[PDB]
Amino acid sequence: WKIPPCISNWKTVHINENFAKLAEALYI
Amino acid sequence: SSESNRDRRERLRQLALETIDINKDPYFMKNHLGSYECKLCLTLHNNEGSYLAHTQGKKHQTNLARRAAKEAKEA
Amino acid sequence: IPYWLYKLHGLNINYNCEICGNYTYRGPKAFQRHFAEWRHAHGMRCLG
Amino acid sequence: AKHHPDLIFCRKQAGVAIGRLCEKCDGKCVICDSYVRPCTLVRICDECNYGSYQGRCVICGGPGVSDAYYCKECTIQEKDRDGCPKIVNLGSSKTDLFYE
Amino acid sequence: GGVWRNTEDEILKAAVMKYGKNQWSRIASLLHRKSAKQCKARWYEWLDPSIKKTEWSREEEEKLLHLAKLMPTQWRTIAPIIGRTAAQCLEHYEFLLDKAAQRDELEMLSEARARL
Amino acid sequence: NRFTVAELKQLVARPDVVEMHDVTAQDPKLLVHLKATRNSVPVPRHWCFKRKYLQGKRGIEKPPFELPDFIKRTGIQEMREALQEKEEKIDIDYQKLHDAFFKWQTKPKLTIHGDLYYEGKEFETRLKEKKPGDLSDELRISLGMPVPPPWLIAMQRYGPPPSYPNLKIPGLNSPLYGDVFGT
Amino acid sequence: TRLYLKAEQERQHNYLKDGPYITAEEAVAVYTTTVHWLESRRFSPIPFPPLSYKHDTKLLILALERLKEAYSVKSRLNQSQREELGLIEQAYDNPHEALSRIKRHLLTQRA
RNA sequence: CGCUUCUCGGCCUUUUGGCUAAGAUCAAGUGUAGUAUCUGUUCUUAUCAGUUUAAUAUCUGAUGUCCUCGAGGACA
RNA sequence: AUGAUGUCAUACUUAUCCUGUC
């Protein structure tokens, strides 16, 4: 139960198959 | 202008001294005219960035292996 | 292989000191320092 | 000098024409290029002062107002008993400054 | 401008390590060559400690090749997704992959094209 | 077309000044005559060096400034140090500085006309040849003898030194005042 | 401002996280409708930058005039705005070099 | 004689009282000559001749035939 | 371990110099 230091202040999958399926359909 | 440049040079010298104290550089030496001089590289440094860049070219730390072998025969 | 460093330092230069027990030197400065040395003076004292 | 290392002097025969200095180069010496200790006046050559070449500055070459003099440090070093130090050539000075 | 010399890069790295990250005006007052936005862009592009400046492999090349066709533009969106995150190594790798691999009547026609 | 060094040394009357680079000149006789003059000075040692006589003192750290006693006895250095410590005025005196500049003026240690500046010129503090019978003060202090130095008691037994045969030291064959116990 | 930028942040991470685009089939129909409409009107394609154009320098002066008249009006500055005004003045001093810069950027730098 | 806990002392870390829009911001030098100091990269070449140098250094020129991959083998 | 040539920044000096024109 110890407080650590605090110096930060200024003082999912990230991909979807629907986008690729839309891009390939637009290319076709 | 000139006073702002003097304050910026003093802040840069203080940041260079803090970086040399944090990294514990044993080769950084100060001159008598406001410049740095490398003891291990045996060369001069024009600015604070010159002594802070002498870590890729002329690596004198790798040349200390002969002195380490002469001081101690064992590994 | 420090070829440029040995060329700038004066290495692989033909030199010989006959007074210092007919020894050979790899440079002109080494030949000048070998002519006035302990072995050269010892050979000069042993020669008379 | 100082202001110009590629400038060459005339070093001609000394005449009776007294040298002069421009208003922008007033007080500056010819050889020593200093501002203190004037001891000897400046004498110009005969060909260097004729018609439109008379009344011009020796160092500056502009409109001379006051008479030029030599420094005492150049007088004691026998640097004032040489020829007429008229600036003949003008290189690497006031050439690119005219374009800007 | 922005030549990004090595002595300036070491000073920028020391200013980022000493002053901070979210203070761009404090880091630009000790360089006298670039502004705060240029210093922040350099710190996010080349002076970042998490930037993988080397080790270009075939898995990342296959990831970038299977992403440039789904999105032709917006290379900055695929910068952190591919893993390079430098916003210029992706375009350089795409240019290297493109240069190394280079070395009603219409329907009535097609209708009779199958019937003939 | 060029004579050897032995032929140039045998022909010269003073062969203790000939060098190895003098044979490559256009007139060795005139160079040997000019190098053996009475009040001539030799050339610098940077004629063959490649450090340009100013790159050898890289790691040598020296003091900032060695002020004289005539400036240190005026109190201006302490006032300047106090002003530098306050910045990081005095008005002590006006006639004391004139007295230290005129009456309390110390003549500095000059050099000879042939005393040219060497390369290092700081680690070779050579001084005449303090020989047998003559010593410095302090080493007297370490020795601790009140006004012979006591190993010239053993220069009685074992004999006069081979190294300095001409020797005389007090009380033995040399029949002494202050420091100097032998000549 | 901080709230609406956070909102745009959430929506952007969403629209990339889910790939939830604009319904690819309807997208294809829209692209086809556009291609057909443009062909029916028979519009020519827009030519890329004619390097020696009679249009070029005149267009560049007009655009730089609008950019100057907006970004500088009267007696204010920054440092960013200062560099902007300075590059504007350099363009109005060496115009063909600036057209060269613009053409090189527009054909090269896709960032 | 050994062991566990508790207390007292000799002592070897760090350590600003808050919140509002990270509280809000910027940070100019011109040219002619010239020097210095950093970094990076290149010569295991053998011999001779000449140029050149204080001496080096440097520069400039070349030597048998066949096969195989400068080296090896064969022949004259 | 100096030195060598070399593309490339960085400091320093010259009391360098800003109304020059047909």
Short mmCIF file of C-alpha atoms in Angstrom, two decimals, chain E residues 4-109:
data_model
loop_
_atom_site.label_atom_id
_atom_site.label_comp_id
_atom_site.label_asym_id
_atom_site.label_seq_id
_atom_site.Cartn_x
_atom_site.Cartn_y
_atom_site.Cartn_z
CA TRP E 4 17.98 18.11 -38.89
CA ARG E 5 21.69 17.86 -38.16
CA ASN E 6 23.06 15.34 -35.67
CA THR E 7 24.20 17.95 -33.14
CA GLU E 8 20.72 19.47 -33.28
CA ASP E 9 19.15 16.01 -32.99
CA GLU E 10 21.12 15.22 -29.82
CA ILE E 11 20.10 18.59 -28.33
CA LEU E 12 16.46 17.89 -29.22
CA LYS E 13 16.68 14.43 -27.62
CA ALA E 14 18.21 15.97 -24.48
CA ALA E 15 15.48 18.62 -24.39
CA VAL E 16 12.78 15.96 -24.78
CA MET E 17 14.35 13.87 -22.01
CA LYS E 18 14.90 16.82 -19.66
CA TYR E 19 11.97 19.22 -20.14
CA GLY E 20 9.18 16.87 -21.21
CA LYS E 21 6.92 15.81 -24.06
CA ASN E 22 3.81 18.03 -23.90
CA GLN E 23 5.85 21.27 -23.70
CA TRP E 24 6.90 22.25 -27.22
CA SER E 25 7.54 25.93 -26.48
CA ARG E 26 10.05 25.08 -23.74
CA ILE E 27 12.05 22.86 -26.13
CA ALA E 28 12.09 25.43 -28.97
CA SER E 29 13.75 28.09 -26.79
CA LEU E 30 17.06 26.18 -26.64
CA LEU E 31 17.78 25.39 -30.30
CA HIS E 32 17.60 28.74 -32.22
CA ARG E 33 17.00 26.97 -35.55
CA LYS E 34 13.42 25.57 -35.65
CA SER E 35 9.99 26.48 -34.30
CA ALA E 36 7.95 24.52 -31.76
CA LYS E 37 5.81 22.75 -34.37
CA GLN E 38 8.91 21.68 -36.32
CA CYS E 39 10.53 20.43 -33.11
CA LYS E 40 7.40 18.45 -32.18
CA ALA E 41 7.25 17.02 -35.71
CA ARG E 42 10.92 15.99 -35.51
CA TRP E 43 10.34 14.43 -32.08
CA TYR E 44 7.34 12.51 -33.42
CA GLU E 45 9.11 11.49 -36.66
CA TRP E 46 12.78 10.67 -36.04
CA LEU E 47 13.57 11.48 -32.40
CA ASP E 48 10.86 9.19 -31.01
CA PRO E 49 12.32 6.29 -28.98
CA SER E 50 9.59 3.88 -30.16
CA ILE E 51 10.28 4.40 -33.89
CA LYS E 52 11.50 1.25 -35.66
CA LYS E 53 13.94 2.83 -38.10
CA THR E 54 15.27 -0.51 -39.40
CA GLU E 55 14.41 -4.23 -39.78
CA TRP E 56 12.14 -4.13 -42.80
CA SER E 57 10.73 -7.64 -43.12
CA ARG E 58 8.36 -9.56 -45.40
CA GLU E 59 5.49 -9.60 -42.90
CA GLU E 60 5.37 -5.80 -42.80
CA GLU E 61 5.72 -5.69 -46.59
CA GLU E 62 2.78 -8.08 -46.96
CA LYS E 63 0.82 -6.01 -44.43
CA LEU E 64 1.47 -2.79 -46.36
CA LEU E 65 0.72 -4.47 -49.70
CA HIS E 66 -2.63 -5.75 -48.35
CA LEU E 67 -3.49 -2.25 -47.07
CA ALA E 68 -2.61 0.12 -49.93
CA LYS E 69 -5.36 -1.40 -52.10
CA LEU E 70 -8.07 -1.18 -49.43
CA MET E 71 -7.19 2.49 -48.83
CA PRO E 72 -5.28 4.16 -51.69
CA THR E 73 -5.00 7.57 -50.01
CA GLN E 74 -4.60 8.39 -46.26
CA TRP E 75 -1.14 6.97 -45.66
CA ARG E 76 -1.13 8.67 -42.25
CA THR E 77 -4.06 6.50 -41.17
CA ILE E 78 -2.08 3.34 -41.99
CA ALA E 79 1.08 4.63 -40.27
CA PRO E 80 0.35 3.34 -36.75
CA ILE E 81 -1.64 0.34 -38.00
CA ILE E 82 1.24 -1.10 -40.04
CA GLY E 83 3.68 -0.45 -37.19
CA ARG E 84 6.10 1.95 -38.88
CA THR E 85 4.37 5.12 -37.56
CA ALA E 86 6.94 7.44 -39.14
CA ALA E 87 4.55 8.77 -41.87
CA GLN E 88 7.40 8.73 -44.43
CA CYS E 89 8.85 5.21 -44.24
CA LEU E 90 5.51 3.84 -45.45
CA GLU E 91 5.59 5.95 -48.61
CA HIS E 92 9.26 5.07 -49.15
CA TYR E 93 8.51 1.35 -48.74
CA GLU E 94 5.56 1.70 -51.14
CA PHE E 95 7.83 3.42 -53.67
CA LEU E 96 10.46 0.68 -53.25
CA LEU E 97 7.82 -2.04 -53.70
CA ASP E 98 6.46 -0.26 -56.79
CA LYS E 99 9.91 0.24 -58.34
CA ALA E 100 11.22 -3.27 -57.59
CA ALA E 101 8.11 -4.98 -58.99
CA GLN E 102 8.18 -2.89 -62.20
CA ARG E 103 11.69 -3.66 -63.61
CA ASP E 104 -26.01 -0.93 -74.01
CA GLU E 105 -24.36 -2.08 -77.19
CA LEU E 106 -21.45 -3.22 -74.97
CA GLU E 107 -23.79 -5.53 -73.07
CA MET E 108 -25.58 -6.64 -76.26
CA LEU E 109 -22.14 -7.55 -77.60
#
